[PDB]
Amino acid sequence: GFPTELKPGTNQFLTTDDGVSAPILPNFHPTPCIHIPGEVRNLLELCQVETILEVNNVPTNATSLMERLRFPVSAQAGKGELCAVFRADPGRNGPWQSTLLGQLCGYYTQWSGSLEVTFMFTGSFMATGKMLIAYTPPGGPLPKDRATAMLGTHVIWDFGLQSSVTLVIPWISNTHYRAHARDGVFDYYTTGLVSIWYQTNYVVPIGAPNTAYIIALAAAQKNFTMKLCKDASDILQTG
Amino acid sequence: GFPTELKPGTNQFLTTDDGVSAPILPNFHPTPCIHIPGEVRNLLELCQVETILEVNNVPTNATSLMERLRFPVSAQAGKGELCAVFRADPGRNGPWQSTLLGQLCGYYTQWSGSLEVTFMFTGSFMATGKMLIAYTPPGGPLPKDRATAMLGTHVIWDFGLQSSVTLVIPWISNTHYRAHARDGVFDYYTTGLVSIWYQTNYVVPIGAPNTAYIIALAAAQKNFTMKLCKDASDILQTG
Amino acid sequence: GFPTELKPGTNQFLTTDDGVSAPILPNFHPTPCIHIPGEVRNLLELCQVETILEVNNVPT
Amino acid sequence: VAQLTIGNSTITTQEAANIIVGYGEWPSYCSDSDATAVDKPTRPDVSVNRFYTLDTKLWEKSSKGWYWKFPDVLTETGVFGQNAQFHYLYRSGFCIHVQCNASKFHQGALLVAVLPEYVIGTVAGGTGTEDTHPPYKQTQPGADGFELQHPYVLDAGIPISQLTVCPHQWINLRTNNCATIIVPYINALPFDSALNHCNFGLLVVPISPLDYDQGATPVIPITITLAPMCSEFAGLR
Amino acid sequence: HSTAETTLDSFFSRAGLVGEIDLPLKGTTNPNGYANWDIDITGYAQMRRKVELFTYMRFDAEFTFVACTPTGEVVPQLLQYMFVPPGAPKPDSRESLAWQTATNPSVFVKLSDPPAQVSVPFMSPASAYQWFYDGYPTKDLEYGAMPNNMMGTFSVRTVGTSKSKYPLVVRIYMRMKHVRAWIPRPMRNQNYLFKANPNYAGNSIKPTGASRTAITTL
Amino acid sequence: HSTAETTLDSFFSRAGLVGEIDLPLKGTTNPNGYANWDIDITGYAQMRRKVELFTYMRFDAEFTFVACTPTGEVVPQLLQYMFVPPGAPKPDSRESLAWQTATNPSVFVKLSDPPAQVSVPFMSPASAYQWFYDGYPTKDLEYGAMPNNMMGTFSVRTVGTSKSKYPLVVRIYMRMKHVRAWIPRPMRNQNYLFKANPNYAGNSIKPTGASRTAITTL
């Protein structure tokens, strides 16, 4: 016959090798692929969808869980008071775990791209005021007050004019390698910071609730990317 | 020599793999294929042939077996009486097992297409009357009487005008999967229903038999198809 | 199938044989090669660089 | 403002907010070269495709959320509940419209979305050791709908904080009252039992609780008017 | 700049272990030197929650078979792996004529011969395997039962009339190839209780993720 | 929309087991460490009724040989599978010079070497193997005997002068390739009594299929 020399690797079964194998049913014509609505092709499609960010990820009591979904603002907050705060950490625990984006991030090891958090004022329509939502880039420390936050990337939101406002988080990268406990994890360190202050107090006329809630939705821009699949989960199929 | 790497699957003997093997007799010139009449190429050719439907599949006594082949109609049946009834179930037991179509269906797991049942009045030529042959689509319950059957797909057959009449069964599909006993069988549920009523009584003049028989033949249209071979049989080669 | 005859050398692992082997991570897109200054290609580049000759290689 | 009419059904609505066409596809019909070219599937135009306005559910501070199953919500109602039962196969689309009638002094937010194959998983006995299958009143709640009990997991062990991944639209009281959606037939099959299978389910949950000072009407009438689009049937019984 | 890693096919390939068969000599476990494994892709723990991201999928699956003794040792034993497509009948005994039915593909391989490997197609009669079903197949114990998702059964056994001389362990891996998916839906945040339904533990309802003290302390 | 599964070649491929040879050490069964198996395609139960759908057929057949010990174990034994075309003489003893006749193809393979596999052609001198014959070869015991349907004989044996050291079992599978068929006829509805004739049991004459009570009760 024809001359050969088997090279090392012969007979190995690589869980990742993606060659072809013999068909079990050679004659079988599998029922045709028809048209189904909403076909997903690449997962990054889903990363660009907005999902509620549980910023108020504090109540854990079983029937208050519907509250992590929206934080509130009220008349009782003096001008300059810190309303809320969280980091630009899609992967790591906390608020981002509720967002779909965060959830996908868990099947990947590295990633980077611009994020986008949109806020929604769902209070009475008769309410007005202003909020100062500031972003303190990675490394920068949470501004001491509303004034110092007013000197860095910020946005005065008059929920009196527009019911919605969207903020773009320029960049976040989870690529710096950490070999802490004994388990080497690829962590941020790029914990950007989003602070929210009462620029003015909550002004509402008589007859309107003195407390409104705000919902914060999040998604990743189109410049987003992920690398290295890493199947991981606390919820697996039970016996 | 030339570099290789044997991949998993090497040395396996698949009963279905259809590769080529070395000829035992390399010089041998097998005697030429001459022309023989009636060559069959695809089995569906045979599914379109009419075969007697044992609608009257009730007599089992050894020498009455020639009766399952034809049911009868007589003077004694009042207008509206139910003459006969069966389902559009080529695979499953009963009347269809006698048809060649039914018999082939047993070597296949899934299938679907339009059927066609033709009736033949073989009574005296001096007889007349009318029959109402109605089809109650899958799901629809057997009509209570001749009147309610008269409201759904039906055909008044005057065996006084035409000796033959053909009915088309629009569609039947044996694809819904059932895991009952412990043996997972692909069954209909599309049991269409063919009912036959005496629209009028059997009118015959003096000198003519007061009983005629009818033969029902069946075949599948051209839109028929079968999938997944499943060799199965009660009759196998004996020791 | 197709006829073969394995020739001597089959199954040997030569530390110098430079064939190809199956990729462990087939989907993985390794981070891009950017431009870094002073790239060395052949070692003889370095042999043409002047380095101090310890002629007075006596004091220890 | 301006009123639209489809037959004998005349609803009064706003000019044209932003509609949501689920998955960008329009409830179209099914062409001739399908699986049943023999039993021509008759396409109900006349009254079958008109405006059905359901028993307005009342919003409260304590409301958990509501959900209806499709086509279950109508297989009960009218001349479409006539075809849905006495017909063997079905394929349809839906112009769903949800409205709130509340003053500029009530506040709230409703997320309105559509979820295919919405399979209700019950609580399972509590501790988790009872394989209880939801009743038939929870699996197909008619046109009265049904109240989620565990809105956070959508009574199916899934975070609602992610439901926006389905066709949805918001009903913030301070910005809008009406919310509209167009749903295309969706299933792994061209046709299917309109009784044994609820292709999807309409979900409308209060994400920002309804609130108001004392004196203002305590409830917000949520009116759900909906109508079939390029709906098709086949095989009478 | 590239985004190929996040594609469905990428996300899903890789052979994952979805099944393990024990054929001990002395045992309560598979006493007849044979076994039946209706093909379940939930065998790979991780898998259940991953696929349940969508409502409809479609794919082919390349299976690879790894067999040895418990110490992970190799032996001179022959084996018959048989595939009984859905609809066909599974062997009830170590001598059921089902072992001989030609329409039940079978691949014979010696334990020494590297892993046997075969591709199985998109069986389902429906246009897609669908993970959720809001109905009943024509309060009922048949809710959410999408039937037409059967991939088949894999019958494993030592070859021969007599019991095999050794204790054996077959492992079934499965690479999913040519994956297409539709209708995406909320990631399971609650623990799984049963293979069939989304039934969760109404007592132990947990927040999707970690919590903190105040919405002002990071 | 496709109909390729219902083609003759499709319907008939697949290697089916048509033969099994026992070569025990201690036995009444094949005491001389050798065996002769005139090629019969009725060995696969199912097969007899399938082919008898037609009157004339034609085909080639790829045979694959699976050999081991009863426990389904593999051993270091060599084997000689020999094919004695029709007309040639079968070996009468474990040393019949028929084993050496070059015109009797023989393939030698070690038990360890994967299954041996060979294609045999359309032997028959007639233009087609024909299942039924309404006559006698030039009340007689030679009715329905279509002679020119001989495919050959397969002589199996351990190689060597002396008896083999192990108990052996050869299995012969057979894939039918390039199948052409003519003249279709009524599916056998009555149980088979003999290999040669359609003789049925005149006492136990059964209705083609299940029965019911009335032609009005379903």
Numbering used by the authors:
A (entry chain C), B (entry chain C): 1 to 239
C (entry chain C): 1 to 60
D (entry chain B): 13 to 249
E (entry chain A), F (entry chain A): 73 to 210, 218 to 297
Study authors write:
Purified EV71 mature virus was heated to 56°C for 12 minutes to produce A-particles. To elucidate the structural rearrangements that occur during the EV71 uncoating process, we have reconstructed high-resolution cryo-electron microscopy (cryoEM) maps of the A-particle (6.3 Å) and empty capsid (9.2 Å). The A-particle interior contained density corresponding to the RNA genome, whereas the empty capsid was completely devoid of internal density. The A-particle two-fold openings are larger in diameter and the internal capsid residues link the protein shell to the viral RNA. The two-fold opening in the A-particle has a measured diameter of 9.3 Å, whereas the empty capsid has an opening of only 6.4 Å, a 2.9 Å difference. This size difference suggests that the diameter of the channel is linked to the presence or absence of RNA. Over all, these two-fold channels are broader and more open in the A-particle, likely to facilitate the release of ordered RNA, an important feature as the termini of the picornavirus genome retains large amounts of secondary structure. The A-particle shows that the interior surface has large patches of negative charge at the two-fold axis of symmetry with minimal interspersed positive charges. In contrast, the five-fold vertex is lined with positively and neutrally charged residues. When the capsid interacts with its receptor on a host cell membrane the pocket factor is expelled from the base of the canyon. This release allows the capsid to expand and open the two-fold channels, leading to formation of the A-particle, in which a portion of the N-terminus of VP1 is tethered to the RNA genome.
Enterovirus 71 (EV71) is an emerging pathogen with pandemic potential. For human enteroviruses, binding of an entry receptor triggers a series of conformational changes, resulting in an “A-particle” that is primed for genome release. After endocytosis, an unknown trigger causes the A-particle to expel the viral genome, leaving behind an emptied capsid.
